[PDB]
């Protein structure tokens, strides 16, 4: 009926995005739906560490080149990531035990990937899932080996590789303003920017269960109080796909001036890691769901 991407742009936002990759675009109706209803794409796997650098100093961009090219041929924006995070990390990186070696390896990984597509990517997720639930920093190899300074180093290196890209930190379970994790990332991002770390945005990996949409109305403005130029809703998916939960997340972005857009975790329910919860906006027939139509109604003039 109508494209939620074109409709959110009519409300002053930048995009309504979706995660995908080569294996999704070559089968089913994925390519047709993304072309019609979305305006930005994110790689699920093709830009993770294990896919781009399975051996030290030896890079590959088979899947990444495919998605970037497809986006350009079809007029879609591109987001990249995740550059520094403990998931999809080859064991050869986690086995490094000394500060300088891991720092140089981390810097070389950031620079190589961002340099390849310099000027073509809007968002780069530079650091992901860096916080524990209590607000302390996750004890990853980067924190244990390099120390707390690895987050400053990552962002400063990314800014030099492509000053045109918006540099994001992202994390999950930032969906309630009363959650210690939400308050912690706000405090640290404020201190980091005052220390010269160029963090452009905060991305909330909004993986919700039924009824958790309302809490985002007050959690998102709290995230925006960190002073970053931008914030965004990343990897959105809701168990049950209730129209009310989805509309609440859309209203949150509409009420936060610094919120630039929303990105969903996928297209069709059967292609989700938790597909048995039917958490996306398209069913097993690749047809719109009630939540999709509710977003359309919420975004019309």
Numbering used by the authors: 3 to 303
What do the authors report?
Here, we investigate the molecular origins of the nearly billionfold rate enhancement achieved by directed evolution of the computationally designed Kemp eliminase HG3 (7). All HG3 variants have an inactive conformational sub-state, rooted in the original protein scaffold, which was gradually supplanted with a catalytically competent sub-state as evolution progressed.
One conformation matches that seen in the corresponding complexes with a transition-state analog (TSA), and presumably represents the active sub-state. The almost identical positioning of the catalytic residues in the free and the TSA-bound forms of HG3.7 indicates that the active site of this sub-state is already primed for catalysis. In the inactive sub-state, however, a backbone flip creates a steric clash between the carbonyl group of Leu236 and the nitro group of the TSA that would block ligand binding. Importantly, the NMR spectra of HG3 and HG3.7 show analogous features, although their inactive sub-states are populated to a greater extent than in HG3.17. Estimating the respective populations from the volumes of duplicated cross peaks shows that the inactive species comprises ~25% of the HG3 and HG3.7 samples at 25 °C, but only 5% of HG3.17.
